[PDB]
Design an enzyme around this catalytic site. Structure first.
Site, PDB file in Angstrom:
ATOM      1  CG  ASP A  28      -1.969   1.104   1.148  1.00 32.90           C
ATOM      2  OD1 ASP A  28      -2.131   1.715   0.069  1.00 32.90           O
ATOM      3  OD2 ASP A  28      -2.626   1.358   2.181  1.00 32.90           O
ATOM      4  CE  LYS A  88      -0.536   3.723   3.053  1.00 30.85           C
ATOM      5  NZ  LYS A  88      -1.484   4.279   4.056  1.00 30.85           N
ATOM      6  CG  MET A 127       1.738   1.106   4.118  1.00 28.58           C
ATOM      7  SD  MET A 127       0.324   0.553   5.092  1.00 28.58           S
ATOM      8  CE  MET A 127       0.030   1.981   6.130  1.00 28.58           C
ATOM      9  CD  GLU A 146      -5.367   0.690  -0.216  1.00 31.10           C
ATOM     10  OE1 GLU A 146      -5.256   1.920  -0.038  1.00 31.10           O
ATOM     11  OE2 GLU A 146      -5.018  -0.153   0.638  1.00 31.10           O
ATOM     12  NE  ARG A 203     -12.632   3.436   2.820  1.00 30.11           N
ATOM     13  CZ  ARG A 203     -12.697   4.419   3.714  1.00 30.11           C
ATOM     14  NH1 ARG A 203     -13.704   5.285   3.681  1.00 30.11           N
ATOM     15  NH2 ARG A 203     -11.760   4.536   4.644  1.00 30.11           N
TER      16      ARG A 203
HETATM   17  C1  LIG Z   1      -0.274   0.537  12.394  1.00 31.60           C
HETATM   18  N1  LIG Z   1      -0.646   1.481  11.315  1.00 31.60           N
HETATM   19  C2  LIG Z   1      -1.738   1.390  10.554  1.00 31.60           C
HETATM   20  C3  LIG Z   1      -1.689   2.419   9.722  1.00 31.60           C
HETATM   21  C4  LIG Z   1      -2.600   2.703   8.791  1.00 31.60           C
HETATM   22  C5  LIG Z   1      -2.536   3.890   8.064  1.00 31.60           C
HETATM   23  C6  LIG Z   1      -3.496   4.177   7.095  1.00 31.60           C
HETATM   24  C7  LIG Z   1      -4.527   3.273   6.851  1.00 31.60           C
HETATM   25  C8  LIG Z   1      -5.514   3.516   5.889  1.00 31.60           C
HETATM   26  N2  LIG Z   1      -5.825   4.945   5.718  1.00 31.60           N
HETATM   27  C9  LIG Z   1      -6.727   5.584   6.476  1.00 31.60           C
HETATM   28  O1  LIG Z   1      -7.345   5.063   7.402  1.00 31.60           O
HETATM   29  C10 LIG Z   1      -6.959   7.050   6.102  1.00 31.60           C
HETATM   30  C11 LIG Z   1      -8.451   7.365   6.232  1.00 31.60           C
HETATM   31  C12 LIG Z   1      -6.525   7.280   4.652  1.00 31.60           C
HETATM   32  C13 LIG Z   1      -6.160   7.962   7.033  1.00 31.60           C
HETATM   33  C14 LIG Z   1      -5.115   2.942   4.527  1.00 31.60           C
HETATM   34  O2  LIG Z   1      -4.126   3.356   3.924  1.00 31.60           O
HETATM   35  N3  LIG Z   1      -5.935   1.994   4.059  1.00 31.60           N
HETATM   36  O3  LIG Z   1      -5.617   1.428   2.774  1.00 31.60           O
HETATM   37  C15 LIG Z   1      -4.587   2.089   7.578  1.00 31.60           C
HETATM   38  C16 LIG Z   1      -3.630   1.804   8.544  1.00 31.60           C
HETATM   39  C17 LIG Z   1      -0.594   3.115   9.981  1.00 31.60           C
HETATM   40  N4  LIG Z   1       0.013   2.477  10.985  1.00 31.60           N
HETATM   41 ZN   LIG Z   2      -4.379   2.726   1.783  1.00 31.77          ZN
HETATM   42 ZN   LIG Z   3      -4.636  -0.290   2.643  1.00 32.78          ZN
END
Ligand SMILES: Cn1cc(-c2ccc([C@@H](NC(=O)C(C)(C)C)C(=O)NO)cc2)cn1
Ligand SMILES: [Zn+2]
Ligand SMILES: [Zn+2]
Ligand SMILES: Cn1cc(-c2ccc([C@@H](NC(=O)C(C)(C)C)C(=O)NO)cc2)cn1
Ligand SMILES: Cn1cc(-c2ccc([C@@H](NC(=O)C(C)(C)C)C(=O)NO)cc2)cn1
Ligand SMILES: [Zn+2]
Ligand SMILES: [Zn+2]
Ligand SMILES: [Zn+2]
Ligand SMILES: [Zn+2]
Lengths: 508, 514, 516
Positions: free
Chosen positions: C294, C301, C311, C376, C378
């Site tokens: 990711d 990011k 990620m 991405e 969901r």
């Molecule tokens: C332990 N950790 C978890 C994260 C984490 C950071 C971002 C996200 C997810 N992003 C989010 O929740 C937002 C809404 C974009 C801030 C994500 O990228 N999903 O694909 C999920 C987890 C960062 N550190």
């Molecule tokens: Zn993401």
């Molecule tokens: Zn993700």
């Protein structure tokens, strides 16, 4: 001398432990020839394998058949000498008395560094904190010179000790087995003195800013001076105004505590052949002033540490007063104040006048260290000394150059810098020489004042050193930046860095 | 009544409080819908839905006593409109007596189960019409199903949103009559004056919160509490600095050091005439302004212009004191506690790193001056347990992390006692102020182990600061059932740019149904 | 099946270790009333003192050796305390004049240990096992534990003992020796013996997931990951199905396909099925988020604290389901039919990537306005949940490292669960209890739904702060008439203290499939 309070519950004193449990420890150094005795408590062998993560092997003869069996090569090769690795087992000896025997891995390199030995001590201390013991015995099966053996004892004492002043059984005997024991015996009581000097400085730094203020800290120095028969003289605001220390006074303008200048002096009994001024930065709390520490990672909850320079100096004052060097006269100086945000605070852009007449343009109030040092240095040179040495938590940039292990040293005199580097070798407080780059001097040319406090051009440690250099006209002077190394983030406590370095300088 | 300090003479020395509101002058009548609707006077509004048909047409069922209105409400005319939730239409016309009347509707969707959020959306649609209406009467016809609680919620919300706060100011006209046609009118009749009480408690809390920090300070707020206590005939006692020092509230006193306003501890008490069988202490966070101290709120989205709201927990407790002191419950003794102060930047402020001693002996290492709420509460909780009560419930705008967890509609409840928490959750259901139970995870407790002090104020690494903040508070309640409501996310209505007065009705339902 | 490379040095398969050292350990359970035999290796007593905080160590077992019993007399042991996590090493000679190692581990003063308590005890036990060459470990249970906590003990002991050296080359631990025998003394032992091999099964399912997660994104890619699922299914004799791009296009999975548009690796949809021999009384679909890497997409990011170097764990949900697939395929429950689903892809920055603002169409026909390319998960889960409901199942359980907001709500220990069904949620919570993978119920707040209203598309991808709740609201739009639960493990998946995956979800999912 009277500590001002906002409410009646505000502390009016810094709690200090003078008599520590370490002072009650009886230390006996034996020679490894003749064999080791295992009668009581904990016995730890310091073992290496000159291979990498190789098996433990005990060389020394033990005067006990039960323990000797446990220590045989068949059993010990189940363990390895990886640096820091330890094991210890409880067992009955020849007399059916309960004893604990183990080891600490000393890697695969013949000569340990100060960092290596430090990790060794921490492994040893962990066992001390986990086991109720009356005696610890350490068998040295490694190569250690006198200065590192002393470093071992000092570090052992410092890490063993626990600060409980703000909370709401130690061993009584230490046995050391080592080859040429008679050569190491004189280092023991030297270590105990170096230990307390470090732990004393530790207590002052770890003390929160509501406890450690310019008034309470100055009172602590007077109390220390009286216990050591050092001459002492505390400068209040009225005197500092007459001395025209406008750089130093400007910084403390925002605080509720009056500026206090600490001047301790040790004179030798005979005739004096070398006069030395030790200057320590004494900012009891640095909020950064109107240039508030708000940026991410500015770590404002650490800034009780910003008087670590003063603490190292006072800790040195303890050591010097205890060991009593001859033919020297030492002046222990500190311009102590607090950098706060108020209606009375000094502003970014202000032009202030130091005692030597130089007008300074303030660009960043969070660069308050060099301002108070500027006046302390002028005061120091007026004493007519041979060496001026300042130690300070001056620049965060040190975290990006040398990091959290080596302190930086700057100076105008090569001979003085050498003696400090030599002191760093014997005290095992690692310092590395950094240059004063004159090509950056032009970045301190103010449009209106005689000199800028800060640069336009980065590398702040050098620029700050360039600034300090302007306030020492004709004296050998050096500057130790300990902003990076002062605090132990892993152990969440101060190091008391600088005490033993400065003492070795005065002594050797 | 202490004197409010000033910097210049133009500084206010009291919080303006509206006690008698126009809402208190509206006469409420509840008629049964089975008998038809009398539509000769004022604005008449029908609450209708169309179950199944998403955004289906409007259809009025109720027979009305007017031939003109009847023809307007015929299905041919009304199916030109849909029932999409919140959608509204209303027309001016002449009745059979050639009087000027106003007839309209509000859409309630296609779900036969109006939630608290939906009902609020319906009410807001109604209020928008009221704010442009000059007729002396509003008639609401419920052609949708609602229970006694949701109906009282309708009245409270209507009353609250209808009323506008003009205290700091320098169109329409309030109706004098409210007509309500609804099934079993006789049962919903006793909900009316309970709603009017719950309304003012909420509006009173809203007035304190909305009042700026130059108006609402520790001195002015505690004075306002005393005035309220005297009007309700409650026992009261404001603890001053000299007394606070005597009680050794070092944590509480530390926060207030940097302020120009002296710390004031509010202690109101309601005791039943009968035999006391339940003893309750309600504790509210009362920071009149929260700059963050030397840990100044300077980051993006730190929202320092909002920080007058940081005494919402206190405002909710006082608003509860109104309701309780008015409704007068039996067999219960209630303490209303709030350690009020102001978190400022000064030469006298406490610093990051400072180790302070609470009134129970524990030394605390301050890691962040912006985590000042738990400090003031710590002393408030030691004080509360010394009173020897059965229940201690604190409510506070404590952690901004609530915005990332439960958001702006649901508050969080933490606690050491399951039954008490269940009692809160039941109070949440009946008061229709939504709360959700969140865990106190003991695995995080070790993050508070200080190197020098008895305990850390905040964590170094461990996020989820809401759980950590509860773990801290739990250290100051030794053997009493205790629950903690974090309203940091729900206190302010960012859409309406005003307080919700969240918690007043929850706490009141808690003590009444106890 | 063929993994694309940029250079010839690029790996083409995830290195996977099936026969781990743990599987070679012989585990004997003995009834503690039959007397402990102390002959070889290391013997550990799990002791405590109810009521007495830091109370003395008292060995209450019977030891079939005079000399060891003499050493363990209460006189000798008084110097030691039962403080939770504390351990000591004893050394002595037994009746056969054999040198022998004995020890204890403190379990505190509480009468019943929590999941965190037992994990603390186990970690102290493993320390005694590390940096020590032992042929055998004997654990004597002088504390009371139910069958679940006992199995959890074994599960945890195996998992923490096992060290992943798949990517160590010139730096393998030259001293990493594993015990070959494990002895357990416990009261009513014959009721615990069944828990041993269940623990070993539960162990590998967790470690298998751990291996997929720990494997970096150059090793674990959409193709190499899907090929690993096939290999597992073949060993477990499960029906398997791997949908490629052409299949995905015909099924019109625009959301899932959009996410992988910018990847050099083709999208791969994993579909595994376990079927009971007999009457199927329950059909379940397990869907795991399968983002092999990711980057965040064009919403890169790049912000401080984004943790882009972590990620690789964004396929933790997928690994948990494949880990569960191993457990179900091995334990072989009855009267159930399980579908293991994972829409696997990579979220990359490229000229082919999907952009913020792009409106895309899910396989249920709903148009979606992308507000953030880093949301991405969901998007992929949306199509996956549609595919799931089309299978005509009773339950759809969803597991994903979905939102970073979990770190601010529940932190690093408790996962969150959302759903449209009270009974299913309770079944998840019940499974959390028995499996000891902590999970807290969080609400789906319908008042927030209005923020997902798009001016142009049917629905918005993201709101415009309660991310975890909003994300649940989005997913709910893609389950029409089936009981569905959503487990957000973005905060609990990674163990930061030990710098390794937890393998979270495998045990919880399996217990849910069984206790069903
Ligand atoms: C332990 N950790 C978890 C994260 C984490 C950071 C971002 C996200 C997810 N992003 C989010 O929740 C937002 C809404 C974009 C801030 C994500 O990228 N999903 O694909 C999920 C987890 C960062 N550190
Ligand atoms: Zn993401
Ligand atoms: Zn993700
Ligand atoms: C361990 N640590 C030390 C620091 C630190 C941060 C800033 C500074 C000093 N400040 C600076 O070097 C600048 C030039 C203001 C950035 C200071 O405040 N001197 O009075 C010194 C030390 C941050 N962390
Ligand atoms: C609606 N909103 C609430 C906040 C809010 C922000 C911060 C905080 C609290 N602060 C915190 O939780 C941290 C941990 C300091 C960030 C606070 O100031 N406690 O005294 C509480 C609420 C910001 N906006
Ligand atoms: Zn500074
Ligand atoms: Zn400084
Ligand atoms: Zn705050
Ligand atoms: Zn606050």
């Amino acid at each position: 001398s009277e500590v001002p309070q906002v409410v009646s519950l505000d502390p009016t004193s810094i709690p200090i432990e003078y008599n520590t449990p370490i002072h009650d420890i009886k230390v006996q150094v034996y020679d490894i020839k003749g064999g080791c005795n295992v009668e009581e408590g904990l016995t730890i062998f310091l073992v290496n394998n000159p291979k990498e993560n190789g098996p433990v092997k005990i060389s020394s003869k033990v005067n006990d058949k039960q323990v000797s069996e446990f220590l045989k090569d068949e059993n010990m090769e189940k363990f390895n000498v990886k640096l820091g690795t330890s094991k210890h087992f409880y067992m009955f000896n020849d007399n059916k008395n309960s004893v604990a025997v183990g080891y600490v891995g000393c890697g695969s390199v013949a000569d340990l560094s100060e960092a290596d030995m430090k990790r060794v001590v921490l492994s040893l201390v962990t066992m001390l904190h986990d086991n109720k013991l009356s005696k610890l015995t350490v068998v040295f099966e490694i190569n250690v010179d006198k200065n590192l053996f002393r470093f071992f004892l000092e570090t052992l004492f410092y890490e063993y000790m626990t600060d409980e002043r703000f909370k709401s059984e130690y061993i009584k005997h230490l046995g050391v087995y080592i080859n040429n024991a008679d050569t190491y015996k004189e280092e023991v009581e030297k270590a105990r003195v170096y230990y307390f000097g470090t732990y004393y400085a530790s207590q002052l730094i770890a003390a929160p800013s509501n406890y450690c203020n310019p008034v309470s800290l100055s009172n602590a120095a007077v109390e220390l001076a009286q216990k050591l028969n050092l001459e002492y003289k505390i400068l209040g605001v009225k005197e500092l105004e007459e001395l025209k220390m406008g750089a130093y006074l400007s910084v403390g303008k925002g605080s509720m505590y009056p500026n206090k200048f600490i001047h301790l002096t040790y004179k030798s009994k005979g005739d004096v052949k070398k006069k030395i001024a030790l200057v320590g930065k004494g900012i009891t709390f640095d909020s950064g002033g109107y240039n508030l520490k708000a940026a991410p990672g500015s770590m404002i909850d650490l800034m009780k540490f910003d008087m670590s320079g003063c603490a190292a100096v006072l800790g040195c004052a303890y050591c010097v007063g205890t060991l009593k060097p001859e033919n020297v006269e030492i002046h222990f100086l500190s311009a102590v104040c607090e950098n706060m945000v108020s209606k009375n605070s000094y502003r970014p852009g202000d032009i202030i006048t130091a005692s030597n007449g130089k007008t300074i343009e303030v660009g960043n109030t969070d660069a308050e260290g060099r301002l108070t040092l500027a006046d302390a240095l002028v005061y120091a040179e007026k004493l007519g000394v041979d060496y001026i040495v300042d130690i300070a938590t001056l620049t965060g940039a040190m975290l990006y150059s040398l990091g959290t292990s080596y302190a930086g040293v700057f100076g105008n005199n090569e001979e003085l810098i050498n003696k400090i580097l030599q002191s760093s070798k014997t005290s095992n407080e690692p310092v590395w020489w950094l240059p004063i780059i004159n090509e950056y001097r032009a970045t301190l040319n103010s449009k209106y004042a005689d000199i800028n406090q800060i640069s336009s051009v980065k590398a702040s440690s050098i620029v700050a050193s360039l600034f300090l250099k302007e306030f020492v006209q004709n004296t050998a002077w050096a500057h130790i930046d300990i902003a990076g190394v002062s605090w132990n983030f892993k152990a969440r406590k101060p190091k008391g860095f600088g005490v033993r370095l400065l003492t070795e300088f005065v002594l050797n």
